[PDB]
Design a protein around this ligand. Structure first.
Ligand code: HEM
Ligand code: HEM
Ligand SMILES: N=C(NCCC[C@H](N)C(=O)N[C@@H](CCN)C(N)=O)N[N+](=O)[O-]
Ligand SMILES: N=C(NCCC[C@H](N)C(=O)N[C@@H](CCN)C(N)=O)N[N+](=O)[O-]
Ligand SMILES: C[C@H](O)[C@H](O)[C@H]1CNc2nc(N)[nH]c(=O)c2N1
Ligand SMILES: C[C@H](O)[C@H](O)[C@H]1CNc2nc(N)[nH]c(=O)c2N1
Ligand SMILES: OC[C@@H](O)[C@@H](O)[C@H](O)[C@H](O)CO
Ligand SMILES: OC[C@@H](O)[C@@H](O)[C@H](O)[C@H](O)CO
Ligand SMILES: [Zn+2]
Lengths: 407, 410
């Protein structure tokens, strides 16, 4: 019941006791592992609230205290009467930070305690949501010196007045399927891009068009808004040696801001909780640019580098891949925009894991997601065994709203 | 129950029904995933059912399920187990068994080749000298002057656990590792302990950077004995680069035949503790892991310097640049010397085709994503984007503790 994890490069062994607090299912069983699978009532609520509040008061060293007991009863009576309850600001902050701390797929959790939390629970309309969002983007961007932040909108009530940010991230590029049959822009956003058009947006039909926010407040139909262009920091991509690189016409936005996840704290569900930190280089250079279903620029770059693309064994794709990633990092650093390379980030994650095992008894981690998409084994996490389990507070996936909204 | 796996690059979705025949446990629970953990005598009682399951599978494979031949074999084996507490496989069953252990190996990306395995039956072997001869023959056949052929040599199964046949080497061919008084290592760090055992057993170590280790062979539970593999039988490739003439002066080379010799082959409940097998290398095994792991030859620095890369900051990605060149060098050298090798792009592409074929004709293909995805350029290979299901099917290859930790010395 006390599992051990070993690093096969340093031989360091850590013992995990934290996993014994996990409640939710992993998708795996004694017969089958689903580790590589992407997506594996008043009576229900109070126990969840109790679990959360107990961990909260324990964190502030007041477990068992009258305050602890008083709060517990207050919430209890609130659920019995209102069928729900409201978190204190302190509980909200502690909850959001811990949902990040518990995110097993995030390699940047060494930064978890520094999260800026924006309480938007007083929001009532989409226009109010737009305002809170612009403020988050401006705050988080900080002229290039990115600061992690989350903005939390009202919690779910009966499920028919949910607040939702239809976008997958606050800032993304549109995608349109052209006559040729090809795709212009980001193929990943082809569908969302049309839903925007399907009701208003006027697309420049470019390769890198910033999508408009489609905000849904109180269950009402979503409304479009253009993020003040001046608030969207973008970085033109060039290479520190290949002067022809800039000719590729490539750029990427500086703020990664997941906006479609669900934040669960003490049983409460916050369906609109956009958060942002900063990029790990490979996210852009390896995945966004080189995935065959994304901008898929490997061939173009290989051709400009004049590499023998006749055979796979010449490793031309690999050589081009490295160059594209050196460019991305070079470009962001040159424009003084925060970004971290996979070596540095993974090194920090190992440090974080050790801290967590020492001070918390463990660190849920998903190896499949933690190991960078390029040069896996030359990063320390590849050699690190990890135990994946679910702890709450948590960030969860949720269905795209267009597949559930009743207009 | 049907289980769906999706490929996030092509949106192709496959349905798995094969997992229903999984018996062994994975190490995971409905509460914790141990997907990245490296390692998470039978009774007459527990043996016939294991035998029955296997023979049922075997007979169904040859389209003779339920036949008189099928029923007689089951009766023959049952009587044999009741009578001797164990049983012997027919040559055909052993061949079928070995091929399927490979076919079921979740961590192997080269399984598109499974049906082509050459099985050498060494169950009549009784001594360590006998084992050496069988192993020499395996290496010569498999090497085939560079046109590698996959093969497996199978020694006598376990009986009471006190007469085990074991190849103490982790692979038939590996380089010695020597821990120096100053704390540094000469040779391959991965083999320091085994090298010390060899020396203690009498091996005269040339103490170089690439000394092929001698075989330490255990027959019938007796103490192991040392044998030197005929040098003329050990094919090696000097490593050089197509554009960098200084690469060759790094003094690197690697053996051409990868031959895992420490796993246990389980077939129909029987345990074959000595079953060396070989195929051929995927370049990253050598170029990424053996050469670039910090705990192995660790050559990234020396290579990076010679390329005059900016090593002042990791963000120059000098490690990644050097890495690619080293792997280019490994592939180029093997191809130049006409020694079979496969690059990670070709191997992963073939594995995806193999996997889809298996779903269609078999109902599944257990696969360990953590092991299948190559150690470099992960997402530019199709397997990175492929959801996999990992489960254990028998026949199978299993880990077993190193023999020096369990052997009762005589
Ligand atoms: C500040 C530095 C940060 C860095 C460098 C970072 C890096 C990463 C990376 C590289 C991924 C994988 C992304 C992908 O492949 O799609 C990721 C995933 C994730 N991160 Fe972090 N992160 C940071 C901040 C945050 C913050 C502020 C939160 C939450 C408040 C967070 C929550 C998550 C979650 C929940 C996932 C998994 C999302 C999914 O399943 O798609 N991260 N992070
Ligand atoms: C013919 C070409 C072959 C190729 C290219 C291939 C490639 C690989 C590679 C790249 C690995 C991972 C090795 C590591 O990282 O340590 C592997 C693992 C494995 N392969 Fe294959 N393989 C081949 C043949 C074979 C054969 C002949 C068998 C058995 C009859 C086999 C059984 C296995 C097993 C059981 C493992 C997992 C070993 C472990 O867990 O440590 N492979 N293979
Ligand atoms: N570095 C970050 N990267 C997040 C990148 C999100 C990723 N590009 C993405 O598309 N995620 C999908 C989920 C795909 N599993 C989504 N949020 O809809 N996050 N951050 O706050 O610092
Ligand atoms: N390509 C192959 N590669 C196998 C390479 C074996 C690997 N280098 C190794 O050291 N395996 C450990 C097992 C580590 N899990 C052992 N055999 O003791 N196999 N083949 O048959 O062609
Ligand atoms: C199928 C497989 O789960 C999928 O391709 C995963 C693998 N690891 C990943 N890791 C990260 N960080 N991000 C991803 O999108 C993925 N995709
Ligand atoms: C800790 C982690 O499981 C370990 O480093 C694994 C990862 N994937 C691997 N994949 C292959 N092919 N070979 C290995 O030795 C490993 N090591
Ligand atoms: O075009 C819409 C897509 O961006 C959307 O469906 C995402 O795939 C989804 O939000 C999960 O990332
Ligand atoms: O030097 C001994 C090692 O080669 C040996 O203990 C291996 O680690 C073991 O066979 C697993 O690979
Ligand atoms: Zn699992």
């Amino acid at each position: 019941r006390f599992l051990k994890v070993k690093n096969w490069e340093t031989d360091v062994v850590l013992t995990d006791t934290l996993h014994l607090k996990s409640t939710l299912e992993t998708g795996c069983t004694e017969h089958i592992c689903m580790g590589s699978i992407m997506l594996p009532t008043k009576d229900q609520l109070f126990p969840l609230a109790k679990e959360f509040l107990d961990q909260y008061y324990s964190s502030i060293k007041r477990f068992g205290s009258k305050a602890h007991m008083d709060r517990l009863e207050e919430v209890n009576k609130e659920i019995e009467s209102t069928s729900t309850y409201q978190l204190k600001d302190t509980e909200l902050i502690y909850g959001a930070k811990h949902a990040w701390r518990n995110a097993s797929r995030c390699v940047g959790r060494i930064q978890w305690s520094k999260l800026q939390v924006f309480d938007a629970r007083d929001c009532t309309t989409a226009h109010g949501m737009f305002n809170y969002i612009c403020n988050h983007v401006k705050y988080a961007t900080n002229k290039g010196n990115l600061r992690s932040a989350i903005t939390i909108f009202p919690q779910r009530t009966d499920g028919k007045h949910d607040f939702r940010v239809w976008n997958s991230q606050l800032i993304r590029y549109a995608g349109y399927k052209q006559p040729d049959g090809s795709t212009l822009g980001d193929p990943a956003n082809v569908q969302f891009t049309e839903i925007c058009i399907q009701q208003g947006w006027k697309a420049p039909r470019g390769r890198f068009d910033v999508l408009p926010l489609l905000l849904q407040a109180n269950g009402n139909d979503p409304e479009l808004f253009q993020i003040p262009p001046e608030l969207v920091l973008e970085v033109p991509i060039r290479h520190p040696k290949f002067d022809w690189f800039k000719d590729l016409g490539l750029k990427w936005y500086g703020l990664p801001a997941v906006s479609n996840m669900l934040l669960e704290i003490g049983g409460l569900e916050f369906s609109a909780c956009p958060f942002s930190g900063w990029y790990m280089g490979t996210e852009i250079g390896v995945r966004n640019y080189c995935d065959n279903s994304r901008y898929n620029i490997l061939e173009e770059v290989a051709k400009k580098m004049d590499l023998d693309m006749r055979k796979t064994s010449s490793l031309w794709k690999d050589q081009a891949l490295v160059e594209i990633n050196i460019a991305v990092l070079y470009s962001f650093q040159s424009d003084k925009v925060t970004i971290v390379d996979h070596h540095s980030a993974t090194e920090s994650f190992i440090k974080h894991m050790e801290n967590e095992y020492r001070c918390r008894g463990g660190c849920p981690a998903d190896w499949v997601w933690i190991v960078p998409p390029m040069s896996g084994s030359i990063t320390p996490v590849f050699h690190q065994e990890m135990l994946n389990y679910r702890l709450t507070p948590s960030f969860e996936y949720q269905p795209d709203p267009w597949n559930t909204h009743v207009w």
